[PDB]
Amino acid sequence: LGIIVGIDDSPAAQVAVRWAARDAELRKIPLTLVHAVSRWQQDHGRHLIDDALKVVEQASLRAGPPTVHSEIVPAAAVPTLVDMSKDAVLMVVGCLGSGRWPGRLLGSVSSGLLRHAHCPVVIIHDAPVLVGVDGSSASELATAIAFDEASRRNVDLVALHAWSDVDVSEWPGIDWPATQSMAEQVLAERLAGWQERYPNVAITRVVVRDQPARQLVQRSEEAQLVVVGSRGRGGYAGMLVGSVGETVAQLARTPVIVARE
């Protein structure tokens, strides 16, 4: 319960705590910390949680999570976490763990959770909340979380819907300016059902023609949280994560929640 947060010897995971700390503060929920594994082992794990907690003390301001759990568990990280997610509000995990290197940008753990966790997965790296919408049901999650979030974080929001999932458009003379304004209407429509629910949060909406990732990504540089579902309109048979989710998760410069289950 509360917001779990896998920890290891990486600076990405260090930082994963600060952001789990404050999110379990802004809601009155337990900040559980889990370090799985396969003794220097046990003794190492001890130090990790000692430092992880040392981060939590620094991180939070006024309250300090109603409970601060942590547990070293002798088991395969993924199976452990995936299972523990079932009874968790959120799954916080660094993008890259110890055993990372240059070209890489995900890992056995972060990768697997985005593909199997039973709760929105948050991958953090090292004021408004940007949201990637296509009304594709898996994002009507994501938009939910995005509002909920921007309430407790007493701020603004930014919706963003790309018209085409396939790139180029360089198709024939389709009237972009006109199909655009009508996508802007349609988007405005399905954020009205929220806009009420949540006054005090300014809904800014943006419609683009083309690539929905290189833009969510990018424009993440200007927000403090990006949110996008684990799946969407399109996608094939045994897929576990949207190609647009994963990519935004591994490339954005801001925490990226990825709604699931």
Ligand X SMILES: Nc1ncnc2c1ncn2[C@@H]1O[C@H](COP(=O)(O)OP(=O)(O)OP(=O)(O)O)[C@@H](O)[C@H]1O
Residue 228 found at the interface with ligand X (CB under 6 A): yes
94 is in an annotated binding site: yes
Look at residues 96, 121, 60, 68 and name the one whose alpha carbon lies nearest to residue 258.
121
3-state helix, strand, coil in the chain (%, to 5): 40, 15, 45
Does 103 interact with a second copy (rule: CB under 8 A)?
Answer: yes
Tokens 């947060």 appear where? 5
Q: Using CB distances below 5 to 8 A depending on partner kind, what does residue 238 bind out of ligand X, a second copy, none?
A: a second copy
Q: Choosing among a second copy, ligand X, none, which partner's interface includes residue 34 (Cβ < 5 to 8 Å by kind)?
A: ligand X
Q: Indicate which of ligand X, a second copy, none lies near residue 240 (CB less than 5 to 8 Å, by partner kind).
A: a second copy
Tell me the helices (H) and strands (E) count for the chain, helix number first.
9, 10
Are 234 and 207 a contacting pair, CB within 8 Å?
no
* Interface residue with a second copy, options 70, 111, 139, 254 (CB under 8 A): 111
Distances (CA, A) of 260 to 18, 84, 168, 225, 229: 23, 14, 29, 17, 6
Residue 99 touches a second copy, criterion: CB under 8 A: yes
- Among 42, 58, 67, 98, contact with a second copy (rule: CB under 8 A): 98
238 is in an annotated binding site: no
What mask, x for binding ligand X by CB under 6 A, covers residues 60 to 99? Answer: -----------------x---------------xx-xxxx
Residues at the site binding a second copy, with contacts judged by CB under 8 A:
38, 40, 76, 78-79, 82, 98-99, 101, 103-105, 107-108, 111-112, 115-116, 166-168, 170-172, 211, 214, 217, 234, 236-240, 243, 247, 250-251
